[PDB]
Amino acid sequence: SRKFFVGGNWKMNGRKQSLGELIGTLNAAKVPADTEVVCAPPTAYIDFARQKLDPKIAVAAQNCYKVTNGAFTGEISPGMIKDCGATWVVLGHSERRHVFGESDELIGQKVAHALAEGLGVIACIGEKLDEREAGITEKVVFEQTKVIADNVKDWSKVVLAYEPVWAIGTGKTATPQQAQEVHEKLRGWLKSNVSDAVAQSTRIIYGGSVTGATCKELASQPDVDGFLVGGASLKPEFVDIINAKQ
Amino acid sequence: PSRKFFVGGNWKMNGRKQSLGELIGTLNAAKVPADTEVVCAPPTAYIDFARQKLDPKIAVAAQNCYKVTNGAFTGEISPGMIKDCGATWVVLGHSERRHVFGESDELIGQKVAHALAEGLGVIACIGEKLDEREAGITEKVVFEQTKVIADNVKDWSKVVLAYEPVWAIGTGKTATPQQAQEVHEKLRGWLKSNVSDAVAQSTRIIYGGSVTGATCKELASQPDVDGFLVGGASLKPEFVDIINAKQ
Ligand SMILES: [Br-]
Ligand SMILES: [Br-]
Numbered sequence: 001s002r003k004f005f006v007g008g009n010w011k012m013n014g015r016k017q018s019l020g021e022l023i024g025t026l027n028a029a030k031v032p033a034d035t036e037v038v039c040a041p042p043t044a045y046i047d048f049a050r051q052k053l054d055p056k057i058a059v060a061a062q063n064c065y066k067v068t069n070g071a072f073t074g075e076i077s078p079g080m081i082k083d084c085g086a087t088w089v090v091l092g093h094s095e096r097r098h099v100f101g102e103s104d105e106l107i108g109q110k111v112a113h114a115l116a117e118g119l120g121v122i123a124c125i126g127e128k129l130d131e132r133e134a135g136i137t138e139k140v141v142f143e144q145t146k147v148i149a150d151n152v153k154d155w156s157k158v159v160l161a162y163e164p165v166w167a168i169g170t171g172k173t174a175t176p177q178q179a180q181e182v183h184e185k186l187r188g189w190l191k192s193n194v195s196d197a198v199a200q201s202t203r204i205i206y207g208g209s210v211t212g213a214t215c216k217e218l219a220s221q222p223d224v225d226g227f228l229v230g231g232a233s234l235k236p237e238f239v240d241i242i243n244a245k246q
Numbered sequence: 247p248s249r250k251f252f253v254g255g256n257w258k259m260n261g262r263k264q265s266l267g268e269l270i271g272t273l274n275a276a277k278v279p280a281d282t283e284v285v286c287a288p289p290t291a292y293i294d295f296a297r298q299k300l301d302p303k304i305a306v307a308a309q310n311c312y313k314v315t316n317g318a319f320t321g322e323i324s325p326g327m328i329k330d331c332g333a334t335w336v337v338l339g340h341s342e343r344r345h346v347f348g349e350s351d352e353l354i355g356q357k358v359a360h361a362l363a364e365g366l367g368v369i370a371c372i373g374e375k376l377d378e379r380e381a382g383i384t385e386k387v388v389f390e391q392t393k394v395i396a397d398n399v400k401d402w403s404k405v406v407l408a409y410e411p412v413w414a415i416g417t418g419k420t421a422t423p424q425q426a427q428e429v430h431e432k433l434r435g436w437l438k439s440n441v442s443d444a445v446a447q448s449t450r451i452i453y454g455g456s457v458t459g460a461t462c463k464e465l466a467s468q469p470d471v472d473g474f475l476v477g478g479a480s481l482k483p484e485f486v487d488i489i490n491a492k493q
C-alpha cells in the first residue's frame with residue numbers, strides 16, 4: 001500500500017520569476033491525495049519556494065553537509081534546511097557522486113545526520129554505463145544501498161531513488177522492464193537485509209528519463225513507487241506525472 | 247583613487263534565521279562608516295533572507311557558485327541566481343572549497359570568468375598551506391594562484407584579492423602584521439608587472455585567517471593590507487570593531 005511519490009528536482013535552473021511561475025502552476029493543479037509531491041529548488045531558492053508553494057507540496061534541498069554547523073564555506077546543514085521550512089533533502093544524487101566526487105562514506109554520513117536532524121531523505125543510487133557493461137549492476141547498487149541502510153534506523157522518512165546513470169545522457173534507453181528489474185532486486189535486498197515490513201513499505205522511485213508520455217508504463221511497474229523527475233519537473237507536464245496513477 | 251577599506255564577513259556554514267537576524271540587527275544599528283565597504287556572505291540558503299534584512303549600505307555575497315548559468319548540477323547555484331537574490335558578490339576559491347571539497351585551480355578560474363561576465367563582483371581567495379610556509383615557497387604558490395585568477399579577469403574594478411594563509415584559517419594563529427604585509431607587498435608587485443600599475447594601485451588585497459577585534463588595528467595599519475575577510479569573528483559583535491578598524 002505504498003503511497004505514490006513524485007519528486008521534482010529542478011537542479012541548477014530558474015530564477016525568481018520563472019520559478020514563481022512554475023510554482024503558480026503547481027499550486028493551481030489538483031494533486032491526488034494518494035500522491036506525495038516534493039519539489040527540490042536550487043539552494044538559493046529553498047526559502048522562496050517554501051513561502052510560495054501550497055503547503056500540500058513539500059520542499060526538498062538538493063544537497064546538504066554532514067554536521068550541524070562549521071567552517072564549510074559554500075555548504076548548508078539539515079538544520080538550515082528545516083529552518084527554511086523544507087522537510088526533505090536529496091542525497092547521493094548522481095551529479096554529486098560523478099561530477100563533484102562525493103563518496104559513499106560521505107553520503108552515508110550525510111544520511112545519518114539528516115535523519116538525526118528530522119529531515120526525510122531521498123537517497124539516490126545507480127550504476128554507470130561501464131559498471132553495467134561489466135555485469136556489476138547488482139554489486140554497485142547493493143553496496144550503495146548498504147551504505148545508506150547502515151545509516152538509517154527509521155525507514156519511514158526514507159525514499160530510495162534508482163537513477164539508471166547508464167541510461168542518462170549515454171544514448172541508451174532503459175525499458176520499463178529493465179527499471180522494474182532493478183527495483184525488484186532492490187526491494188529484495190531490503191527484504192533480505194532489513195525486514196519484510198521495510199521492503200513492503202519503502203518507496204523506491206525511478207530517476208531515469210520520465211515524461212508525460214512515458215510515466216504511465218513506468219508507474220505501472222509493480223516495484224516502481226514513483227519518480228524523481230529531472231528536466232520535466234520544470235514544465236507544466238510535471239502535473240501529468242503527478243497524476244500518473246489516475 | 248584611494249583604495250576603499252574593505253571588510254568581508256564569511257559566515258560559512260553557521261546560523262539560523264533567529265541568530266542571523268540578531269547578527270544583522272546589530273550590524274544595521276552600528277552605522278558602518280561610509281569609508282568602509284562591508285560585505286556579508288551568508289550560507290547559501292540565507293542569501294535572500296540576509297539581503298532582505300540588511301541595510302542597503304551593506305552588500306551581500308554568496309559563498310560559492312558554479313561556472314555556467316543553468317544546468318544539470320544538482321546542489322549548485324549560478325551567478326544569475328545570486329544576482330537575482332540581490333547579492334552583488336561571490337567568494338571564489340576559498341580554502342575550504344579547494345582543500346575540503348577539492349575544487350581545482352582550473353575550475354576556480356572558470357567560475358571567476360563566469361561570475362564577472364554575469365555582473366557580480368568577486369572576492370578571489372589565495373593562500374599557502376603550513377608545509378608550504380615552513381618550506382619557504384609561499385610566494386611561488388600565491389603567484390600561481392593569482393595568475394589563474396588574473397587569466398580570467400579582464401576588468402579588475404569588481405575584483406578583490408583575499409590572501410588567507412591556510413594555517414591561519416580557524417586555527418587562531420593570526421598572521422603577524424609583518425607576515426601579511428610581506429605577502430601583500432609581493433602580490434601588489436605581481437599585479438604591477440603582470441597587469442598594470444593602475445590595477446596594482448586600485449585593487450584591494452585583503453587579509454583573512456583568524457582576524458579578530460584585537461588583531462585588526464595593527465594588521466590594518468600595514469600599507470598593503472586593504473581590509474579583511476573575517477570568518478569566525480564575523481559571527482560576533484566584534485565584527486563591528488573590525489569594520490571600524492581605521493576609525
Ligand atoms: Br545553530
Ligand atoms: Br574566512
Ligand SMILES: [K+]
Nearest residue numbers: 219221222224
Ligand atoms: K507501481
Ligand SMILES: [K+]
Nearest residue numbers: 466468469471
Ligand atoms: K592599510
Ligand code: NA
Nearest residue numbers: 169170171172
Ligand atoms: Na541516454
